[PDB]
Paper text:
According to all existing evidence, HP0310 was recognized as a H. pylori peptidoglycan deacetylase (HpPgdA). HpPgdA is a soluble protein of 293 amino acids, which has limited sequence similarity with enzymes of the polysaccharide deacetylase family (pfam01522). Nevertheless, reliable HpPgdA homologues can be found in several pathogenic bacteria. For the above reasons, HpPgdA was proposed to be the prototype of a new family of polysaccharide deacetylases. In order to escape the recognition by the host receptors, some bacteria have developed a mechanism of chemical modification of peptidoglycan, in particular through N-deacetylation.
The crystal structure, despite the relatively limited resolution, 2.57 Å, appears quite reliable: the electron density for the protein main chain atoms is clearly visible from residue 2 to 291, without gaps and with a good stereochemistry. The polypeptide folds into a single domain, characterized by a non-canonical TIM-barrel fold: nine ß-strands, labeled from 1 to 6 and from 9 to 11, are arranged in a central barrel surrounded by six α-helices (labeled α-2, 4, 5, 6, 9, 11). The more significant difference from the other members of the family is represented by a long arm of about 25 residues, from 161 to 185, which extends away from the molecular core and embraces a nearby enzyme monomer, strengthening the quaternary organization of the protein. Four monomers are present in the asymmetric unit, arranged around a four-fold rotation axis. The enzyme in solution is also a tetramer, as confirmed by gel-filtration experiments. The putative active site of H. pylori peptidoglycan deacetylase is represented by a heavy ion coordinated to the Nε nitrogen atoms of His 86 and 90 and to the two oxygen atoms of Asp 14. A fourth coordination site is occupied by a water molecule. Since a similar situation has been observed in two other mono-nuclear Zn-dependent deacetylases, polysaccharide deacetylase from B. subtilis (PdaA) and peptidoglycan GlcNac deacetylase from S. pneumoniae (SpPgdA), the ion was assumed to be a Zn. In both cases, the main difference from our structure is represented by the accessibility to the active site: in HpPgdA the presence of helix α1, the longest helix α2 and the fact that the loop connecting helices α7 to α8 protrudes towards the active site opening, makes it poorly accessible. From the structure analysis, it appears more likely that HpPgdA binds a small molecule at the active site, though we cannot exclude that a significant conformational modification in the ternary and quaternary structure of the enzyme can take place in order to accommodate a large substrate.
Author numbering:
A (entry chain D), B (entry chain B), C (entry chain C), D (entry chain A): 2 to 291
The structure:
């Protein structure tokens, strides 16, 4: 009795990512790559998912929602779940609590008008926080997050109020020689993010980022994702194995192929169940309450 | 009835690239690499193309035209198409509309005196824009561009006048929470650029660029280009598959070899037709007008 | 009669690394990755070591000691050696001699209260010095270091007092055209660090570091470690082959697997003896005194 | 009748490289890696060369000469050629003509006192120029250089006096829209440098360099060097194939192995002749004068 819950979470960065994270603000050429993600990328992923009768979760920035209305329709009509992901993919930590709350508000209503239901799930743009737990909870609806990394392949409840001492070399060592102090567990369930299961850093060329990659090969990345599944399957009876992808990157033919190899491999395993993130949270909320 | 139009577009960066893009301005050693591209690199590619009875398009910067006159003759005499690519490979977006127009003017007359005909095609240096659509059209001749990335393996007509709201954290979220607004379709046909089909970023060492690579292997890159062909061939009946290369990089023995494997692989496929970019634009203009 | 002493040295950077070296100070998301290292990472490595009845040395920052008390207990109870590694993983060279001495003091007493014995070994955070030899010696206990790189696969005694002339282009060449002047041999034994046998640089994504990697594949790294063993085994009769790893990186399923291949390979060789660093120093102190 | 002249040029950066190029000035830990290059690195390469009865050329910085006197003796006694490479590996282009001349003077006399003869060959540290042609010639002895990149696998005579127009966006396009103007051929013969045949950039980790690599695998690099040999052998009857290496990197067991594969491969080819750089210049001076 092995139950491995595997899922694809699709972050639709498209133009919003270049506006909010990736330095493409003033680059007609980058913005053009954003338009590819929405207009050409979204449909290719939907083709991929349908070919394998797969469900999925789309974390769609408001901007992407209002900029690719025809593709948004295509996603809702497939029965896929829609989660929040900012408006212009702004890093939550560079905003005021007001700015960040106005963005969260705006995203909620965008997704409600589009789908009928309010979104249950959230992904922080570029994967930041600050006091997002507070708002995801305050801002109702939000049942789970997929931005944090306290864990690997098991969900968990997010503690709010963790604290730590930064180093200050203008002071004496005892002033900062203190441990991190864990806060208190909340009801926000975390389906963890993982840099090792994210297609974008390794495979998207970002000219303005000193840390850019983009020419790591789909085959080395494909193999690494499989390696992680193999271990997890071997060492766990209950695990959730979620993959973060973007149409910006994963709708490119060479990585489209990569996913076909990943999907076919996973489907050779028994106990595997493809789901959406909301179904992972629901199951976890039942699997162990409090 | 599968028609896959595949083409090699050769950007002759040589010395111009180091002067305009790659930080080699004050580096005798870099400039020396530029002289290799023109004097030794150009002939090696011509040898490659002739061995496989391949046509090709060369996007030659003015500077390269006036600096390698003997090699320019070798290219014209092979019957290859010549497109524009700046003078000293200056990024269009750092120029005034006047500077950029004087460069365009100068390039046009350089290519006309060299070939007899004015150039029909253009590639923006390092792949920028600004209001280049306007000028490529205004500046007559220009029938197509190969700098933008709204699409993959299908050409398209370039809309001018797209607009978007940048993020300003000095303002309130509603001030920038707006979609991108598409402009209006022009007659400039785009045969799209693609970082995943460009030899330079992965394989040229650029000391002054924090984002430099240069030691990614021709074999991982070769494989990635093939992977893209394989998918495109499998999933499309009409597609254009163009590769951007530079004598600076692709005339190096280890990547010369890489292309022989790529070319031999493509030639095993039926429906494949090697062409020049101008022939791709002509066919597209007919394949679907307006 | 071949004696190859091979060891795993585990640097528990966890949260301390993000606080002291890796720029994660103000990143809830990074700090969350630090918590993974301690809470989830430490136990996984212990599982790995136990599966192969391997001993090991853990270089635990004070911060990690006071932040993961339950996991610290799990390590001591396995019989593994505990060495120093700062408090908040602060780079020794950015501290005053007082700051650096207070950190050393504090680490010593932390490790003594936890284990009963004072630590014999030390690893400089991020691998710096300054006048650490002086203090490792002064601060008693410290019998060996694993931060320096004068050598490969043979330990040695650390000279204190080496000097060299820096270049100053405001002066005349003869002012800095002088050799490095070796100081005098101390009793501090060095079991050498090696970037080619460190899991973190190649495989941890560090957003704030221009020099970040993180998407190099475990299989290419695995192969490189093996390659080094193979040569050493082939060319030496007495050598010490130590690997630096972090729960932050090596407790990730894809590199967990990498180690199983490394361990199984090494165990196919005769003359190989798995030990702790303290046992390597003891043996070396006897193997050749002075 | 195929004559392929292949050679190993060893740049002994050791401590000088960290002092002059690689940012290791204030890093005891880096300097320690420099000491490895000289003390442990030099002998390992000599072992490599002797195993295959190979000749070689060592470009030794003055600093390295005066810092590793025992290893210098080992090199001279093997019959290997010694060329110049600065004192503290200072980039020629950051110096005054006086500073650069004093360094050249000092290097000449260092190498003369050590070997008896003055050096015939030179490599610019980190591969710069400025008006080095003038001095290599003026400063007598110097018959050849191995810093420039006008060509691949054929030597050539260095033109002095090349000029080009830099871009200035404060001016009008016509002010810089001019070609490069070739100067006049000198007698300095160039045995060309090549980033694609240099072990250091891909495989040495340099913390202070944003462009650092260091975890590219010896096997991908090994294969790339071989690929270049294979093409050159296939396409040329007379070529010189020289490899630039450093004890800092190539004396590391995993790349030591890489070279054994490279050497064994080259030795399977007929027409191949292992030589020193001086022998390559002598042959070229005769092969075609003027
Ligand atoms: Zn995103
Ligand atoms: Zn170009
Ligand atoms: Zn550490
Ligand atoms: Zn050097």
């Amino acid at each position: 009795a092995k139950e491995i819950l595997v899922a694809y979470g699709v972050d639709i960065d498209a133009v919003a990512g270049w506006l909010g994270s990736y330095g493409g603000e003033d680059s007609p050429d980058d913005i053009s790559r954003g338009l590819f993600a929405g207009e050409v990328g979204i449909p290719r992923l939907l083709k991929l998912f349908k070919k394998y009768h797969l469900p999925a979760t789309w974390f769609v920035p408001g901007h992407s929602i209002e900029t690719f209305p025809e593709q948004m329709k295509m996603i809702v009509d497939a029965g896929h779940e829609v989660g929040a992901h900012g408006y212009s993919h702004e890093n939550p930590i560079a905003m005021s609590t007001k700015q960040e709350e106005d963005v969260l508000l705006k995203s909620v209503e965008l997704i409600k008008d589009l789908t009928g239901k309010a979104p249950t799930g959230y992904v922080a743009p570029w994967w930041e926080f600050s006091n997002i737990t507070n708002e995801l909870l305050l801002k109702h609806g939000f049942k789970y997050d997929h931005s944090l990394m306290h864990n690997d392949f098991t969900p968990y409840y997010v503690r709010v109020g963790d604290s730590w001492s930064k180093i200050d070399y203008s002071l004496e060592a005892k002033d900062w020689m203190k441990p991190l102090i864990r806060g208190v567990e909340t009801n926000l369930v975390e389906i963890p993010a993982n840099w090792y299961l994210d297609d974008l850093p390794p495979m998207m060329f970002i000219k303005k980022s000193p840390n850019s990659f983009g020419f790591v090969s789909p085959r080395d990345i494909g193999q690494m994702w499989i390696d992680q599944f193999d271990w997890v399957y071997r060492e766990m009876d209950y695990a959730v194995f979620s993959m973060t992808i973007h149409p910006d990157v994963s709708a490119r033919p060479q990585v489209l192929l990569m996913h076909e190899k990943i999907i076919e491999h996973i489907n050779k395993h028994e106990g595997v169940r493809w789901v959406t993130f909301n179904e992972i949270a629901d199951d976890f909320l039942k699997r162990n309450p409090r």
